[PDB]
Design a binder for this molecule. Sequence first.
Ligand SMILES: [Fe+3]
Length: 329
Amino acid sequence: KSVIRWCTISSPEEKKCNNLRDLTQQERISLTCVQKATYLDCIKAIANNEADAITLDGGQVFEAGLAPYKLKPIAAEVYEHTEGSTTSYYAVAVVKKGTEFTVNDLQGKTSCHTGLGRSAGWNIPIGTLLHRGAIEWEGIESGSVEQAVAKFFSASCVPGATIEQKLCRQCKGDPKTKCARNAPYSGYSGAFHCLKDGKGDVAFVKHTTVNENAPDQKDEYELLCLDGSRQPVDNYKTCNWARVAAHAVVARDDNKVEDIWSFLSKAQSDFGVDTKSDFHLFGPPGKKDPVLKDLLFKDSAIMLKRVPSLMDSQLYLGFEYYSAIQSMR
Ligand SMILES: [Fe+3]
């Protein structure tokens, strides 16, 4: 009857979306999938009524909420929390055991990031190191944050970086695709593999990333904490760089939001973590090639929760994280 258009940003993603399309062809709200080059092309397409929805990291919810787009988060991913579940996660910095540098010794190291402008992979680590005085950046007029970061680290893999060569030097893949936002070393799992393969000394990822990727070998890794110590991977509640809002589905502020939520509400009922189907909407998490990870929704999401309609992107991210992204922008 009514169709919603999901906007995807990679070929494994479009494939996953088209599999869900085939499984919901008999539902009152059906699905079709369009694929774009980047999440930004998807924000443009949705604001242009060529697509209806996409899940975005908190840093990208920020951009989606800006004029001329003015898309709003309509549903948030929920992650497992010791006390039930939460719509937030922790940004951590993962290093290997037996290297011995602290957060104060990061100058000249190589680094692995989920993507330019993402919460855990960029906004939180780069924003924190500017605040601590480690990365010297004197405002946007002084040039880009990319330039300041490429001065700090000796080389990096930062998917989506465009000004600095050095920020794509450590990425794996074809020349044309190695530093793309859907490259091999992109996302939480991609940045973890960049560290595992020795292409970075530190990977800026989230609290579930080592479990999702090397659960057997997680004691070969540890976390770099803000107080200068190193703690085990499971000690992220006391060794994290920030708690950030969950990834969220964004949409135009118009009446299609109810069709999108009814579609999502039913799809996680049928294909959620307790599904009897072979199709999983969320993950499952576990070792597999990183380009197959966090497709449509993160592998670590366990449910979607409706966001109150009165929350826009600023209220969703919170005033403090919103002004932190505005000050690096
Ligand atoms: Fe994220």
